[PDB]
Amino acid sequence: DLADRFAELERRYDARLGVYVPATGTTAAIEYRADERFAFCSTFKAPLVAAVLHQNPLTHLDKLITYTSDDIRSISPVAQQHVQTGMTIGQLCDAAIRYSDGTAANLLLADLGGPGGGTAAFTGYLRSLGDTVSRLDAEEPELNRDPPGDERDTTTPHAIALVLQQLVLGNALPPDKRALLTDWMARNTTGAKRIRAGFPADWKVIDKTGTGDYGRANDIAVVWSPTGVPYVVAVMSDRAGGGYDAEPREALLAEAATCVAGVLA
Amino acid sequence: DLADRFAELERRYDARLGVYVPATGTTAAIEYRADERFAFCSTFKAPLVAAVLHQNPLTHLDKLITYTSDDIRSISPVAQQHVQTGMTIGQLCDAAIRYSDGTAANLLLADLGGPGGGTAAFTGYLRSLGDTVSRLDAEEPELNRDPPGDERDTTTPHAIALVLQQLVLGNALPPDKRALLTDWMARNTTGAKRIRAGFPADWKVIDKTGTGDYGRANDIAVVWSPTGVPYVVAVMSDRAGGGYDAEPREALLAEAATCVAGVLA
Amino acid sequence: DLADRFAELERRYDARLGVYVPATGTTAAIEYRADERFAFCSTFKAPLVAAVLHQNPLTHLDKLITYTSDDIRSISPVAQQHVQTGMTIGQLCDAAIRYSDGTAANLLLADLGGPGGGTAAFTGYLRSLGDTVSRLDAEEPELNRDPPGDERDTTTPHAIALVLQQLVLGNALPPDKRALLTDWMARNTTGAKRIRAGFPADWKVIDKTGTGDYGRANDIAVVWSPTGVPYVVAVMSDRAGGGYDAEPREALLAEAATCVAGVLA
Amino acid sequence: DLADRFAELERRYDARLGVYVPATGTTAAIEYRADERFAFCSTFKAPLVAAVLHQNPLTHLDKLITYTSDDIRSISPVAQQHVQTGMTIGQLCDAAIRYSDGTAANLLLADLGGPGGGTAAFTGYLRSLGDTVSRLDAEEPELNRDPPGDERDTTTPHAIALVLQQLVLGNALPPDKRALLTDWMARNTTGAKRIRAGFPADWKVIDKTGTGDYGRANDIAVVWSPTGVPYVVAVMSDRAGGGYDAEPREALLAEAATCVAGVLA
Numbered sequence A, B, C, D: 001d002l003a004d005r006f007a008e009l010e011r012r013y014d015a016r017l018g019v020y021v022p023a024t025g026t027t028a029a030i031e032y033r034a035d036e037r038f039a040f041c042s043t044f045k046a047p048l049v050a051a052v053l054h055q056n057p058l059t060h061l062d063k064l065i066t067y068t069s070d071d072i073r074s075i076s077p078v079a080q081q082h083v084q085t086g087m088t089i090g091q092l093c094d095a096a097i098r099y100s101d102g103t104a105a106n107l108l109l110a111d112l113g114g115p116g117g118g119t120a121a122f123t124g125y126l127r128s129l130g131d132t133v134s135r136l137d138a139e140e141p142e143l144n145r146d147p148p149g150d151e152r153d154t155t156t157p158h159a160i161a162l163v164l165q166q167l168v169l170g171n172a173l174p175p176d177k178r179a180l181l182t183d184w185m186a187r188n189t190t191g192a193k194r195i196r197a198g199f200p201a202d203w204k205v206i207d208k209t210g211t212g213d214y215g216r217a218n219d220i221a222v223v224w225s226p227t228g229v230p231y232v233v234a235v236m237s238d239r240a241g242g243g244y245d246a247e248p249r250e251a252l253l254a255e256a257a258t259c260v261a262g263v264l265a
């Protein structure tokens, strides 16, 4: 039983492990705490980019957005260097996926537009992909700091997985819009020590990481087999027992992913 | 129930798969066809270099060995380039391991001395290491093409996995010699597509490959988890039903090594 | 007349090129715009680490440095994943060289201590080595975006080439420290397409890269002949005529290197 | 100029160096002892398989050739493992290129047919490519050991370049046949320590080596620049002053190819 190994890593790293791999024609689904709620954290920036892509035509990307020093609130390695010049919507998609830029996310959220920075617009977009569970209620960085047991800004390894299956493998976007999102994820720069570290090198890995308080660490990915077969992997985790300032354990995610690789090989 | 996945691979590739992973304090031993005989092929060169190292003072490595054109009877990518200069026992060790050089292995066997070019001497070194089943009856390239069912030049995944363990991890050698074999194997250039390919890149892998007729392909290795725990992995396979000319499938080996990796995480 | 090839590359890549290789015993010094000023960019992180190493005992490298979100001001691939846990002075040295992490270089500059985040100190360390020309007046990322003609945050291929010769080949650091700096520069991950790409593979190359705006692209390195002769190579280029957003051209650097390689053979 | 580096290596390696790079549209011709005669050695097997390719249709490759133990007269790593079974013409091509198999060459010569193992036939195909100079008179291994000064079994770095240019870059063979020759030369296994070791790794290199007595070391190659420009490089060398059993110096060839690489960049 793969679940015993998934229940060993929890004890080993003292964490709560969630895993979900959508079943294919050739393989059953992998499930561990799949329908338990975990905090999005930064992983919501994947479906956030595809939202803006879906409501707006390709030219919307060349729209410039200006901002000030007060708009920078979370880790923003790209946004802090363009406060004077401003950024085009496309650049904020690149910053938000590849570098998990917090400000670009809050901006892309306002670009969706609506109540409370268009968080509701975002959940809305998740409801037209058939996901009725997930929700987003705060912005960066408060969405990372909700206490355990609270359902705000939460998702489930089961529900995000399917979302990413629809977005990268399905027909949620047109191909030329699907091309941009995939590339941004294939060039993500924050997922080296996670899912990307547990799959052999001759597997392809696109991903979007998520980190937060209470030892939260997420990586959602689409990996390709050396023969070209695609699968979707969702790994979410937190260490609430350790409290607010518990340390997130990346190795847990990399070790988990290796277990998935073994069954997927 | 990792045996089901191994039995699925055998079907997928039209091959017979044999795997052994010695037990560790934390984990149980993995066994598929562990006590069946497969052909040594060029995996006998790892303990061959051990035997040479074992019976000689370190100074012997500088002893120059000269040979003639009629000695190059198989592929010898290195020895073929030194027929006029000659080679030292060390350079023959390096080539026999790192480039699986055929001529190197026969000269080493000769340096062991005794009946039949030192095949008997080699087998006695394995008996002294406790190996009760393995046997080397011929030289390169004959030892690669024995017909199926013939027990000559065969070992078992269980037997060789335990020899490798003692040579690298145990005390069969002193540290100053053991450190040479480990290096040579650490820098093998013929197994990028086998065990190396099924294990993530943060796992250290040292190996010696073997390939022969009847679609034979083996690889024996020591692997170090990212945390530092060492494991020994014997993977051997043949496709003797397809006949003499059958094609080895390196992907089988890699895929089994990826299966072993999930179980070992 | 190697200065005819360098000039032809300048014409071809629409760039200004600077090249210095100190003279060895066997060979003369290679010079092109050698005494002209080029922006440091990230190449300052190599002597910076040597600065921290020099002023502190080896166990100072285990000091834990904690930072916040506001401290992530440029791309910081490592620092951004450790905001919770904090980084050691050893880890910061690692990431400033190998991933050219920006937050790590800024922190280290502070650990040097002194006026304006320790840039006066970094400079003073260069003055103690003999460099009377270089200067460091800003932090990351402001030090990459100085307008052409300005002398703030600049060195010269001549000047930097001699600093790197002392730090690595000379005795500006005791062997135990020196070997750490040498090892970090040997495992660089940002210089695959620059000097490394311009030398044959059987030459060992350690290096630190530099990139900025105005198509700035530098790379400083020590290289070892196959026989073991060390040379220091300082290559720097910009394209400030094409303005702030001009694209750097790595292949200019990989080609210059290929020219220096032939002359040194 | 580049000729003074070429006269340095001669002194450095105590040898006689011959370099020829035919001029292209963009570059001039590199010449050093370009018309001085050097022993073919095993580089005649490049034009040899082309000759067999040329005057036969593609189906002639499947023809089978049986032979005996007495035919095995030179280093024959592949032909010695097929005495019983025999070899097809194509195996004799691949073997004679990639592994420099002596027996396979002497059989290909005899397949061309005619006087004295058909050597005249071979020269009879060189003149038709315009080469008035070169000649082949003996078989393996005698062609490798004619004395210095003698003209049998010689070509010139100028005369064999323009054949390899026609034979890979020209219209000497149709594409179908062209494809096979080229592939065999890009998979050669005897030229890692020569031209291939002196050009950067992002340059493509195909070659056929030659080695013999009197310290004779040749390599002829077609190399591609990282941008796609092809070049023909002919390096040949002997050390006639050190006697019949003088050691060949591969390093000279690598260094000369690195010197060719610098101007070509």
Ligand SMILES: *C(=O)/C=C/N[C@@H](C(=O)O)C(C)(C)S(=O)O
Binding pocket: A041, A042, A043, A074, A075, A100, A102, A140, A141, A142, A144, A210, A211, A212, A213, C069, C080, C081, C083, C084
């Ligand atoms: C991505 O959306 C955010 C993660 N936030 C964490 C991080 O590691 O970057 C914190 C908790 C450090 S943060 O909200 O600054």
Ligand SMILES: *C(=O)/C=C/N[C@@H](C(=O)O)C(C)(C)S(=O)O
Binding pocket: C040, C041, C042, C043, C074, C075, C100, C102, C141, C144, C209, C210, C211, C212, C213
């Ligand atoms: C190394 O010298 C540079 C770091 N930053 C520059 C870069 O090209 O990566 C900037 C200024 C563009 S950045 O902080 O991304």
Ligand SMILES: *C(=O)/C=C/N[C@@H](C(=O)O)C(C)(C)S(=O)O
Binding pocket: B069, B080, B083, B084, D041, D042, D043, D074, D075, D100, D101, D102, D140, D141, D142, D144, D145, D210, D211, D212, D213
């Ligand atoms: C052609 O491939 C040449 C072989 N010549 C020499 C070699 O080193 O390979 C000898 C000495 C083996 S030979 O005269 O056959």
Ligand SMILES: *C(=O)/C=C\N[C@@H](C(=O)O)C(C)(C)S(=O)O
Binding pocket: B040, B041, B042, B043, B074, B075, B100, B102, B141, B144, B210, B211, B212, B213, D081
């Ligand atoms: C040792 O057993 C390894 C390799 N040799 C085989 C190979 O596949 O290359 C032979 C015997 C077929 S070979 O001609 O080297």
